[PDB]
């Protein structure tokens, strides 16, 4: 996990979402020092506790309601329950990495200081503290948006259906922890978007330098230069590392509820477009169907474009290889060809798989494969 | 995008189609200097848009008519819509490609321009001019029988069906812009395969090359050979990452709809088989599965050439390096084997996928699963 | 196989499952000498042969008999057949491989018995003894009380469809030999964690030892440490290999019984879920899903530590070249760095696939497929 | 295709099966010269056509005839088309790399007649003579029986529902050509896996000599003895790649008619299993079964064990490198492994796949998929 200054906004709404139970303080230097928060670290177990505890709950009073409004079919009942259940395993994955991976973003926050050192020539503050809290205000939003939607939709659902016997609206209103555990999803995914985003930037930041400085007395100077871009480099992917060892687990959970969530409500979009009872919650699912594909990406975008500026680091060092010709340099960017060859550059989601764009392939066809099943069943009945 | 006197028919086809929206002047030398055209920037882009707005809204209307020919029933409507909507997708991608492509087609342009000068012994301007006109014609003529054959026969279908109540035959009139985004899309994939051909066929060039001077005072010049062939080496490289970096989501896009296509048209040529209605719509259906595969085979084949080029010449170097002892040659000879030992010679479609001919057996294997999933579902019932 | 002083309790207990038909005498220093066990070579072949023989008489006679209890109806047949035939295949590999590898069982205990005097610092005999007895006891454990939880199930599930004309009970009765098997199968699945987690553990102590060595007139001596753990390595590599060559078609079917274990309990888990005759039925299943996945778990997760302990070595490596500098230990490590440049690490089950967590993934995909079209084939009838 | 006179047997049986049309003349050194026979050429051609035409004139006439015995319902239709079509595929194929590999054939077995004189000393003539006689023998038994079985069968199925008004032998009179195009595609395979275990074989000849040689004046003769065997190396993965550019599109289409025939086979066994019909047709078809995995395994291992067996030589030359200290031995066994670094041992199907024990599990994967649609298809019907 990364907290840096100019993304500090991010760090405090993780915290508050209980997924980042750090104090930080801000050194006479900068540098924000990192440490345990205790009060912190039990208020993130706690309300993860109560929330999922909460959840359930209210999954088990609609079931058990005198006209569940979302819990009514067998059919109906299952995917609920599966859609709630990806979100639970995704948020209490996401704060279980939080609570244990302390070590993990002090070393990676440590590395990641020394690497912007290196690299301060190409540090834009203020445009990093403007990409992060773009993203985090964009990605907040859209989930509020998409939770209104929601709730008004399934207020309406519940006011059709709705018998003077009893009151539906209650049943939705025992949804609400669902919905927090949607936003503290999106937190959750926010926080690993900008830590990624961090990694991918500060490779194509080395390689920009690299690129600059070696193919657009001295000679000394240059040999130090390159070794300090070669450090940054192998830095650079010991936090991918640390990154995939803190939070593989998180982005295993996510990405298997943004295929579940992908194939259910395409299944569904299709099922009420066949249908066409509703259009306003054809465009509700539409917009969530939107959502998932757009959260999906970014879990995927940040990791494959940390592994490709990795990876192109070679190239440029093969092509200032070829163009060097000073002893001590040119044994420099052979010891660097040499580090580069045998680079893991790319996000391991705990070993079960690589995190890049091969896994949207993988996705489409699972999606495509289950959604005809699916659909050309209900067709056939 | 190659832009190259020998296959200039294949660009000013493409510019008509609203895919190559450059102003090309030939200059004194015979370098054709490529610059941006902005009248045919915004003819392209007003034809797209205006070409996709009258294939939706043929679409509606063939829907909304008194009795549709084409968009009938759910499954037909989700077909047709779906047929259209990926043919949408491909034409558009072509066409965003071409618009924001203007500086790697200029890039690609001058390596092939230095790579050629290179590899001037083995260029055969005839023979390059006659296959890449052979290519665009028989492509071209294909489509063309193939679109003519299709309304033929979707006009016999509705008179058929036509009833005194309204005319029938509008409604096949109004598919016309389908057709015409069938030709775009023909000439998208005419322009792409040109390139890709052209790369690997330079790859070969290069390898034919390498293998007559090292394998079949003037050490000098020797090595001063051998490294303009493993500099031109590394720019075709660099060429098929341009290709790759303008045209993989044009080429994703094509790849997703020839694999819908061929699964469609093997579903409907199936159950056709089975009823036995028509035996002129299912040659037609035949002959639409094998331009489906022809085109799937027009956008792999290069790619896999390409890359097959591109990495036997590894073994041809290491040929050299173990028949070579001059000082120098060798040194040069070591240099390059290194060079090759890290190329990335395979196009990538948006990091999507890997094309080559493994995309084939992907394809076949998703084919063969939905049309048994399909096929045993119409059967059973 | 592993058979070492610390962890002779899990040779004994496959010695008497009929899996490891060696006798074993410790001599004066400690080193326990492996020959072959003619006496229990014969035990292990006909327990086997009688054990598979009277699981297929007890199946027999259960679909013949009066009112089955198991073998009822064709689906369950056929499902019954072949969860027994899966136990049946992993059971019968692993007493083969067991018969068949006393060359390589000796060569790898001799390999292990020299590496462990290169780690000597590092062995922990009460650490590895207690984790290897607490693995087999609790494997053993939970295999005993799933076994008494099913039979007590099946014979309640008998009484209740008891008929006066016949006892049932004695169908259930019959029923035993497959749950020995199972016990055997269990035996053969800690038998092999233990070989594998051993290889990863000492993979492990390597790479400690060389970071603690190397990264936190003496020189000869610090080079002959080196080449010594390099030798290690290699000879680690070494053993790897020699399980995979033993045990490779017992761990394919491991493998192969796992997923269709899996895949039968999430069917009938799914199928009673919606059906909800009786819970206790529901909680003994899914007592069953978590005892196959956690021995998925057993079979995967050492070949996966053994390959990553394995591949990071090269790392480690790297950093000692970049941070070493004398004559030659600068050449030693130069040979390991090459020897690690080309070592295959991972355990291969008989060559059909990679042993690895990506195993889990494919296993999870497959699944998700069968269970779809099985679920959506039984919602629609 | 290799043609040696230790195993002319297979070659005479290909040759008389159109499949090798190459007259061959024994030299007076005992090398087998061959050319192209305009003759044999003919004949194969023509007996290709001809028994093609005969087989799908037999479909036509049993589709067309009074009462079919096997294309009598749709589903039963397709399906003996389907595998007739795969067969013949696969034979066309086959007999269509034979005409067109004079040049290949011919560059094969000069390679392979080198690299015996290399590797003289592990020659064993009649070893080689008798397994392949002993292949090839085998094949064509099995082939033999299981036509004469097949045709028994279908005499005693047609007989049962013969009716006086036609007789319905001579339908299945006018099944031979199938069997005899069984007949080819078994020869077409025997020759094929004769070609990959000669050099899998060799290139295990050659790691026991390299092991033999180097670890169990005179070094130059020592260096020249280990040039000799990395040029034989070189040479026998130039002659997998020969096999593979002449016979890959005949091995992709023996894996695809092994995939349908399993496929299909699989499927109609577990039909007649919940059917139980008649047993004699229960185990002709497990027979059938057999064979298509026998052969399937056939093409698959040969591959396989060619692969891994150029792959371990990297193993070895690394153990000779870090055990030999001579200067030009040295540098001579440097060169053999970089050239073993860069070596692609495994033989590739046309590009579309990579053949080896990995085609085990995808096949597995697929039939497993295929059979669950289709079983669970006719369960819930």
């Given at each position: 996990m990364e907290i840096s200054q100019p993304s500090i906004g991010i760090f405090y709404i993780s915290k508050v979402l209980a997924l980042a139970p750090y104090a930080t303080v801000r050194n006479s230097k900068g540098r924000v020092e990192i440490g345990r928060s205790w009060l912190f670290t039990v208020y993130?177990?706690?309300?993860?506790?109560?929330?999922?505890?909460?959840?359930?709950?209210?999954?088990?009073?609609?079931?058990?309601?005198?006209?569940?409004?979302?819990?009514?079919?067998?059919?109906?009942?299952?995917?609920?329950?599966?859609?709630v259940s990806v979100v639970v395993m995704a948020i209490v994955s996401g704060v279980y990495c939080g609570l244990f991976s302390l070590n993990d973003t002090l070393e990676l926050n440590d590395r990641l200081n020394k690497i912007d050192n290196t690299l301060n020539a190409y540090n834009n503050f203020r445009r990093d503290r403007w990409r992060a809290l773009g993203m985090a205000a964009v990605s907040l939003l859209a989930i509020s948006i998409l939770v209104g939607l929601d709730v008004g939709t399934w207020?309406?659902?519940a006011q059709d259906m709705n018998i003077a016997q009893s009151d539906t609206e209650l049943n939705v209103h025992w949804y609400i922890p669902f919905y927090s555990l949607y936003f503290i999803l999106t937190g959750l995914q926010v926080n690993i978007a900008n830590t990624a985003y961090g990694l991918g930037r500060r490779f194509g930041r080395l390689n920009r330098m690299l690129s600059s400085s070696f193919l657009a007395a001295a000679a000394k100077n240059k040999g130090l230069l390159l070794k300090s871009l070669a450090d940054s480099h192998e830095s650079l992917g010991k936090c991918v590392h640390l990154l995939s060892n803190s939070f593989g687990i998180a982005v295993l959970f996510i990405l298997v509820s943004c295929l579940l969530h992908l194939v259910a409500t395409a299944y569904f979009l299709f099922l009420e477009l066949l249908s066409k009872r509703?259009?306003?919650?054809?465009?509700?699912?539409?917009?969530?169907?939107?959502?998932?594909?757009?959260?999906?990406?970014?879990?995927?975008?940040?990791?494959?474009?940390?592994?490709?500026?990795?990876?192109?680091?070679?190239?440029?060092?093969?092509?200032?290889?070829?163009?060097?010709?000073?002893?001590?340099?040119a044994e420099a960017v052979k010891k660097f060809w040499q580090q580069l060859l045998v680079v893991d550059a790319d996000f391991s989601a705990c070993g079960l798989c690589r995190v890049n764009r091969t896994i949207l392939t993988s996705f489409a066809s699972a999606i495509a494969t289950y959604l005809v099943i699916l659909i050309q069943f209900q067709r056939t009945n």
């Open positions: 993130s177990a706690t309300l993860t506790v109560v929330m999922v505890f909460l959840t359930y709950r209210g999954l088990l009073f609609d079931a058990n309601s005198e006209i569940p409004v979302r819990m009514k079919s067998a059919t109906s009942k299952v995917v609920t329950a599966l859609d207020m309406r659902i509703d259009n306003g919650y054809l465009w509700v699912q539409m917009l969530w169907i939107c959502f998932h594909f757009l959260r999906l990406l970014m879990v995927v975008e940040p990791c494959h474009l940390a592994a490709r500026e990795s990876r192109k680091t070679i190239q440029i060092v093969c092509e200032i290889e070829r163009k060097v010709h000073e002893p001590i340099l």
